[PDB]
Design a protein around this ligand. Structure first.
Ligand SMILES: COC1=C(OC)C(=O)C(C/C=C(/C)CC/C=C(/C)CC/C=C(/C)CC/C=C(\C)CC/C=C(\C)CC/C=C(\C)CC/C=C(/C)CC/C=C(/C)CC/C=C(/C)CCC=C(C)C)=C(C)C1=O
Ligand SMILES: CCCCCCCCCCCCCCCCC[C@@H](O)O[C@H](CO[C@H](O)CCCCCCCCCCCCCCC)COP(=O)(O)OCC[N+](C)(C)C
Ligand SMILES: CCCCCCCC/C=C\CCCCCCCC(=O)O[C@H](COC(=O)CCCCCCC/C=C/CCCCCCCC)COP(=O)(O)OCCN
Ligand SMILES: NC(=O)C1=CN([C@@H]2O[C@H](COP(=O)(O)OP(=O)(O)OC[C@H]3O[C@@H](n4cnc5c(N)ncnc54)[C@H](OP(=O)(O)O)[C@@H]3O)[C@@H](O)[C@H]2O)C=CC1
Ligand SMILES: CCCCCCCCCCC1=C(C)C(=O)C(OC)=C(OC)C1=O
Ligand code: SF4
Ligand code: SF4
Ligand code: SF4
Ligand SMILES: [Zn+2]
Lengths: 63, 144, 342, 176, 96, 115, 54, 156, 208
């Protein structure tokens, strides 16, 4: 026997992700463009989820 | 056969240049065996061999008392062995660098250096690439 | 701002804060906290040390790789100071003893060394100089420690006019000589107090508060040539403070009055130890003076810091001084002491 | 096919029973163990006299890394970045650009020795025998930073160990 | 071909040297800077051009299997020599 | 009907009942945790932290998610009672070595590029 | 090793002589070989018991 | 002076005694500890140098971190390092201990033991050979021989 | 073919196909699919409600006797509505055979615990809960097995970052090990390795 919940799915509280990384982040859902250097199309089949690019800096040691 | 081993001990005492050399080698290496000299370093390390010993004790080195800049009468380490005698001493080959010298090159260090950690000669890492982003330099003259 | 000295990152261990700091006296009580706070945000910290390197080891895990550089220095040799301050934009001075040795008196460590450091820093182009003085620093003080402190801050302001002088008052912490001093005085049975400690008022300050104040003074642009007084939120009569200290440690409090000359004689008797003295005449003097009130000076609240009360952090120092029977007693058990707050 | 390890029964004759009782009362097998240890006492020990004597190694031994040169003194590395791609621990960092004479050479070549797993995959991937794992293993340091090698350090290691490295490669290259 | 910067810091073969106002120089105080003195560009410039009497030459770096992948170099241009893209040796047809 | 199998609770009321039971258990536990782990915080601070942790998830309306949250809270409490957690794990709830990160626009603009 | 240069790398002498060997060495040490889709559970009698990989 | 000579001789005596009697804790984490077992094996026989394993932290002088330090393990390692009486030393052995090594980018691995405890000697290798660890131990002995506690106290 | 190619075994393939037909006939209520792979491995895809019956039948039936639970694990496929793929590997010593049983679940639907069928499942189920977040109903003692105390999240999920969210270091001001947001001196370098040319035509999918 079933309970028939009537709300949209939401599992954010169960994933252990910090709040900053849930609300602030923007994801791109896209089929990656073909690499213009090659003619193969096998990398343009599936959809990809990626996150927005954040800051990268230089390490004071080793650069 | 007891007299034989005692005479062998006396022979080991006498074959190190007398009593003083015997005590010197005993307090410098905790070992008093006598073996056939194979060669000597330009830094002063001597290499001895005795094929009658078991594998691992058949080749050994008496280190020098003065390497590049430090006194090694007591403070010795395995990093004081030059690469050719390093290859001979670790049994990667059966041929000493005396009979089989290494190939000479113009970029090979003529002077071996030991482990220089803890000394002002220690290696300090740094980034070897140039600056990436170039900044705009404002003019040196007033604008009005 | 010299691009390599531009802040980068999130403000963490691997980030860049843009601070290159030379912390004199970083191997002591305040120095370890200051170095920890500098290394948390990703600063480049230079530690000049005269002691054996084994005594600097606890400072190693305080920064990322390459962010803490240890160098030998000599207080009487200006070349060492110049060598250790060549590439720094911040110089913090925490050098100081609570006793006099056969090689360094109070003038050596509170006047000559700070003046040499400040002059070398000014000639080396160092931008910021943080110097530590005492709240009770006074030219006409009965303590040579405080007279030397006053002369030293005068000379430091002379040599480095843009220097920032910070005047704390009896810092208390895990490795202090304030709570541990009174707690260890239990080994002699009774607690000797001049005038029963009824004519002395203390305003002790937390160690983390002082370190955060130093960091905020480094990062604050208006605190260049100011003088700050770092004090705690409450003022206590010495008798009540010591009674509270013994209460938190769960040790029997047996106070008795001692004449000033007798306590001075006791301090002189303890001064003969070739090792770190248990107490000194200067310490006996400084313990029994009321903390000065300087309302004209900016405090911790001007640097965005709310001073931590002693009643919130006394257990983390005094739990070590308890017996096995009282180790698990809670912090809210021991009846906060009465405060003479104006 | 199998065998039993603990499926034997003892004979119950008076001879065997008396022998077992004597074993219980006079501790014969304990004396056997004592005799075994006593036998080992008079044998020659297997200890070697380090650092004056060393354990044996092989030409294939994977030790400290080194960057090599051609006999003219030119660097073998061509900045192809195969070693960087193959590295299981991402210990290699490479940056390159055309040299002043238009040659394909590295500007940055770092190996994080505290990331390295010393697997030898980099010298397998190298097509010009530029990067190798040398015979050295005695290079312990006192600070972590000393184990973050850059191009200069690796080139110095090559210049210092080339005499042994070339001999080991000469002895081993026909198996590769 | 080592060279000293205006501050005394050695300039490495990649042309890297800290500026006078760079704090990172403090990492070399009481210590040294690791610079390899055998600049490969000068050493390969010191190598003489090899005269060969064919239009196409073959180079493998010497040592056979101990060199680099074998490549073929065209020498039709008399203006410039033919350089190996791996080892940097130069080849040329007879002229003058 | 969305054809959803429950975990423990048929609907929201039983979920709130389980939440209340877990809250009672944590509220009882806090003084014993302060005594045993030798914490420099007070019992009031610990109960405030428990209340804050419970209120962090106050927006959940799915009974299954509440059920799993109660399961995780029971796991945490069982870890704390058996002293499987250490003082570091207990005090990780308080974040004392982390600097307070500002929330207004201008401070974020000053420090860096993060939104 | 299996005489299939799309799985096992060629000998270093072949890689420095033949174009196909160089291409296969490059691609095997940069990208690696592609494994056809599928799942396997493989077990061996390791000295400590059954050691398996799914 | 006479006092300088006396304190130098006393420093020599104490340094010799401390470096000639080094007792590491019985403490190992992973593959590297196996090589540690080979450093006590008859071929190398670290006991001949005066190096003896002792289980109690209270009776140990050196901590050899032989293996990967995980987040679950870091408080335990810190605890048993703190319970070691002073003077005490830490030897970091193998890639995982030195900087994380093969598991540097993991979610459950401490990127080097120097984030938890101060380190005196770093022994590279995955794992370092028993000879390499013996070289590290002898280097630590030399570093102890360089100590000048009593001279520093005298010049204070 | 010959030397470089793996040989085929048709006998085992036919035997496993026959036994898969047998099992599917005996339990139509739960068995959704049966497969035999090219390297002779039998897989049975079942409904989640049939975990305890099917497994029990495989352990206790005279003709199955799959008495050993070799491994139990989960696979995460984020593109599926039912995220997690629960895999049981069973060994039968009497018939010298191996079988695999696969079911599915999502983040919020529990899977029945199998400890009453195989005791070996106990820790295995714990590990799944620790690594993927799949809850197992009626598990005698369900808690984390592999992660640190108080660890938040399930690391083996595909959307979990490789280095996680927090890292540990000792702090001298508080005199203890503390956790702080991750910062890497060197960031892990992502590599794009997939070739843009198709490798295996036998697995080509319809172009939709
Ligand atoms: C915080 O700083 C301090 C220290 O550092 C950590 C100390 O060690 C320290 C001294 C440490 C004590 C344990 C010394 C106690 C020993 C006393 C001298 C005992 C008192 C007299 C004895 C001889 C007992 C006999 C009494 C009569 C017969 C005389 C003190 C006082 C101190 O204050
Ligand atoms: C009398 C009761 C109270 C006092 C108790 C003490 C009893 C006397 C202590 C005996 C001391 C003997 C120690 C000396 C042995 C040193 C041997 C030599 O090797 O030392 C070298 C140099 O010597 C040391 O530098 C100095 C050691 C001696 C210090 C000076 C003597 C001070 C004596 C003062 C006695 C006062 C006692 C207290 C009185 C109240 C360093 O060599 P090392 O690197 O290791 O070996 C390398 C290992 N190799 C060879 C295998 C490669
Ligand atoms: C005519 C009348 C004369 C009078 C009678 C005299 C005759 C006496 C004959 C019997 C004498 C027996 C003496 C032995 C005493 C105890 C032996 C014994 O039976 O105990 C063993 C156990 O003894 C041991 O195993 C000892 C264990 C510890 C061993 C420690 C090292 C071994 C000793 C090394 C050499 C000893 C050197 C002794 C002399 C030292 C110099 C003073 C039984 O134990 P279990 O096999 O487990 O069986 C019990 C259930 N039935
Ligand atoms: N403690 C308190 O309650 C408050 C502190 N004061 C002042 O705050 C400053 C720092 O405080 P605190 O950390 O508690 O003091 P500490 O005694 O704990 O630290 C003293 C530091 O100064 C160094 N030092 C001392 N003498 C010399 C010297 N002759 N040459 C070189 N270095 C020396 C010490 O190095 P080494 O380890 O080698 O000895 C050590 O690093 C001090 O200037 C103190 O006077 C201000 C108000 C009170
Ligand atoms: C006296 C004989 C030498 C004992 C060496 C003690 C080494 C201590 C490391 C602990 C340890 C032990 C005991 C051990 O047995 C083992 O193998 C499973 C480990 O994994 C490598 C260990 O780390
Ligand atoms: S030996 Fe292995 S881990 Fe080390 S640099 Fe080479 S490929 Fe990378
Ligand atoms: S060392 Fe070899 S593989 Fe690595 S970049 Fe240089 S030439 Fe390529
Ligand atoms: S460094 Fe290598 S051998 Fe040592 S514990 Fe780590 S993985 Fe194992
Ligand atoms: Zn060439």
């Amino acid at each position: 026997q079933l309970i028939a919940v009537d709300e949209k799915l939401d599992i954010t509280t169960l994933t252990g992700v910090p709040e900053e990384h849930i609300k602030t982040r923007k994801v791109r859902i896209f089929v990656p463009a073909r690499n213009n250097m090659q003619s193969g199309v096998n990398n343009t089949k599936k959809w990809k989820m990626e996150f927005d690019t954040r800051e990268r800096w230089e390490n004071p040691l080793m650069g | 056969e007891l007299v034989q081993v005692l005479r062998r001990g006396l022979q080991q005492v006498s074959g190190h240049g007398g009593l003083r050399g015997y005590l010197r080698v005993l307090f410098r290496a905790n070992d008093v065996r006598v073996g056939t000299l194979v060669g000597e370093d330009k830094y002063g390390n001597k290499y001895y061999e005795d094929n009658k010993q078991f594998f691992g004790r058949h080749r050994w080195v008496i280190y020098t008392t003065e390497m590049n800049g430090r006194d090694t009468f007591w403070d010795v380490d395995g990093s004081m062995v030059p690469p050719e005698w390093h290859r001979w001493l670790h049994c990667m080959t059966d041929d000493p660098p005396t009979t089989k010298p290494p190939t000479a090159r113009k970029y090979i260090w003529t002077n071996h250096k030991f482990n220089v950690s803890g000394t002002p000669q220690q290696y300090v890492p740094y980034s070897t690439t140039r600056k990436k982003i170039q900044e705009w330099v404002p003019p040196s003259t007033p604008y009005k | 701002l010299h691009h390599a000295l531009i802040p980068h990152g999130k403000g963490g261990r691997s980030s860049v804060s843009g601070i290159v700091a030379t912390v004199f006296g970083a191997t002591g009580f305040l120095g370890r906290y200051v170095v920890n706070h500098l290394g948390r945000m990703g600063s480049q910290v230079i530690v000049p040390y005269r002691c054996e390197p084994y005594d600097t080891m606890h400072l190693r895990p305080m920064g990322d790789l390459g962010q803490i550089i240890f160098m030998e220095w000599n207080g009487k040799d200006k070349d060492s100071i110049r060598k250790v301050v060549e590439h720094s934009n911040v110089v913090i001075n925490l050098v100081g003893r609570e006793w006099e040795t056969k090689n360094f008196d109070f003038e050596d460590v509170f006047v000559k060394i700070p003046h040499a450091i400040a002059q070398v820093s000014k000639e080396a182009g160092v931008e910021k100089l943080i110097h530590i003085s005492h709240l009770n620093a006074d030219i006409k003080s009965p303590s040579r420690y405080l007279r030397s402190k006053a002369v030293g801050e005068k000379e430091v302001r002379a040599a480095f006019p843009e220097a920032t002088i910070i005047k704390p008052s009896d810092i208390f912490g895990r490795e202090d000589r304030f709570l541990n001093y009174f707690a260890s005085m239990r080994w002699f049975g009774g607690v000797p107090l001049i005038s029963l400690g009824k004519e002395t008022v203390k305003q002790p300050v937390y160690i983390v508060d002082v370190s955060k104040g130093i960091i905020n003074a480094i990062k604050d642009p208006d605190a260049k040539g100011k003088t700050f007084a770092f004090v705690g939120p409450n003022r206590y009569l010495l008798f009540d403070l010591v009674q509270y200290i013994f209460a938190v440690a769960y040790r029997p409090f047996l106070p008795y009055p001692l004449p000033h000359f007798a306590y001075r004689w006791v301090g002189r008797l303890f001064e003969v130890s070739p090792f770190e003295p248990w107490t000194t005449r200067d310490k006996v003097e400084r313990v029994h003076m009321s903390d000065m009130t300087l309302p004209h000076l900016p405090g911790l609240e001007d640097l965005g810091i709310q001073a931590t009360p002693l009643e919130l952090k006394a257990i983390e120092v005094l739990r070590r001084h308890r017996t096995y029977r009282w180790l698990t007693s809670e912090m809210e058990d021991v009846k906060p002491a009465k405060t003479v707050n104006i | 096919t199998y065998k039993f390890v603990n499926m034997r029964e003892p004979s119950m004759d008076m001879k065997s029973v008396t022998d077992r009782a004597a074993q219980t009362l006079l501790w014969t097998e304990l004396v056997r163990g004592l005799g075994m240890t006593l036998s080992y006492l008079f044998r020659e020990p297997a200890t070697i006299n380090y650092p004056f004597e060393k354990g044996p190694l092989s030409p294939r031994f994977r030790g400290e890394h080194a960057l090599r040169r051609y006999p003219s003194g030119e660097e073998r590395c061509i900045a192809c970045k195969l070693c960087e791609a193959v590295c299981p621990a991402q210990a290699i960092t490479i940056e390159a650009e055309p040299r002043a004479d238009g040659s394909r050479r590295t500007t940055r070549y770092d190996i994080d020795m505290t990331k390295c797993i010393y697997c030898g995959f980099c010298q397998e991937a190298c097509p010009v025998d530029a990067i190798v794992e040398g015979p050295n293993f005695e290079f312990s340091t006192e600070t972590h930073e000393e184990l973050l090698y850059n191009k200069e350090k690796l080139l110095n290691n090559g210049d210092k160990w080339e005499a042994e490295i070339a001999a080991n490669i000469q002895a081993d290259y026909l198996y590769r | 071909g080592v060279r000293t910067s205006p501050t005394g810091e050695k300039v490495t073969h990649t042309g890297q040297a800290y500026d006078d106002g760079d704090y990172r120089r403090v990492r070399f105080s009481d210590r040294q800077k690791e610079v390899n003195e055998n600049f490969a560009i000068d050493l390969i410039a010191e190598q003489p051009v090899s005269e060969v009497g064919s239009r196409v030459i073959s180079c493998d770096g010497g040592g056979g299997a101990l060199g680099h992948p074998r490549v073929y170099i065209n020498l039709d241009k008399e203006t410039k020599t033919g350089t190996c893209g791996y080892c940097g040796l130069q080849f040329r047809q007879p002229h003058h | 009907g969305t054809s959803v199998k429950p975990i423990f609770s048929r609907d929201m009321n039983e979920a709130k009942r389980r939440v209340r039971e877990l809250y009672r258990a944590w509220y009882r536990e806090v003084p014993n945790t302060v005594h045993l782990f030798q914490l420099d915080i007070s019992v009031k601070q610990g109960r405030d932290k428990v209340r804050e942790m419970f209120m962090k998830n106050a927006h959940v309306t799915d009974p299954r998610v509440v059920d799993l949250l109660v399961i995780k809270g029971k796991m945490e409490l069982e870890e704390t009672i058996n002293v499987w957690k250490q003082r570091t794990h207990i005090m990780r709830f308080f974040h004392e070595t982390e600097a307070p990160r500002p929330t207004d626009f201008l401070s974020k603009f000053y420090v860096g590029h993060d939104p | 090793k299996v005489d299939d240069a799309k799985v096992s790398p060629p000998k270093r002498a072949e890689m420095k002589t033949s174009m196909e060997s160089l291409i296969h060495h490059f691609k095997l040490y940069t990208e690696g070989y592609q494994v056809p889709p599928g799942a396997t559970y493989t077990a061996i009698e390791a000295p400590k018991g059954e050691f398996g990989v799914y | 002076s006479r006092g300088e000579y006396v304190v130098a001789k006393l420093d020599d005596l104490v340094n010799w005694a401390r470096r000639s009697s080094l007792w590491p804790m019985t403490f190992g984490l992973a593959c590297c500890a196996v090589e540690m077992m080979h450093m006590a094996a008859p071929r190398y026989d670290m006991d001949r140098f005066g190096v003896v394993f002792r289980a109690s932290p209270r009776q140990s002088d050196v901590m050899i971190v032989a293996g990967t330090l995980t987040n679950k393990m870091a408080p335990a390692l810190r605890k048993v390092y703190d319970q070691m009486p002073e003077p005490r030393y830490v030897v970091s052995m193998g890639s995982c201990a030195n900087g994380g090594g093969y598991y540097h980018y993991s979610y459950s691995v401490v990127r080097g033991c120097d984030r938890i405890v101060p380190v005196d000697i770093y022994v590279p290798g995955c794992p370092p050979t028993a000879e390499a660890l013996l070289y590290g131990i002898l280097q630590l002995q030399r570093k102890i021989k360089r100590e000048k506690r009593l001279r520093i106290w005298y010049r204070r | 073919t010959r030397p470089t190619i793996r040989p085929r075994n048709d006998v085992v393939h036919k035997q496993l196909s026959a036994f898969g037909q047998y099992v599917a006939e005996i339990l139509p209520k739960y068995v959704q699919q049966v497969q035999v792979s090219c390297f002779n491995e039998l897989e049975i895809f079942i409904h989640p409600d049939g975990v305890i019956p099917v497994l029990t039948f495989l352990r206790d039936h005279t003709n199955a006797q799959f008495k050993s639970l070799a491994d139990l694990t989960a696979v995460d496929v984020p593109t599926r509505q039912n995220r997690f793929e629960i895999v049981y590997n069973l060994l039968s010593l009497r018939f010298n055979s191996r079988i695999r049983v696969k079911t599915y679940t999502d983040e919020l639907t529990p899977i029945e615990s199998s400890v009453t069928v195989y005791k070996a499942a106990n820790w295995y189920e714990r590990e799944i809960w620790d690594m993927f977040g799949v809850f197992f109903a009626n598990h005698p003692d369900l808690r984390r097995i592999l992660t640190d105390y108080g660890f938040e999240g399930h690391p083996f999920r595909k959307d979990f970052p490789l280095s996680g969210y927090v890292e540990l270091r000792y702090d001298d001001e508080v005199k203890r090990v503390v956790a702080e947001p991750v910062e890497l001196a060197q960031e892990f370098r992502k590599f794009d390795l997939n070739s843009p040319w198709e490798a295996f035509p036998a697995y080509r999918q319809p172009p939709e």
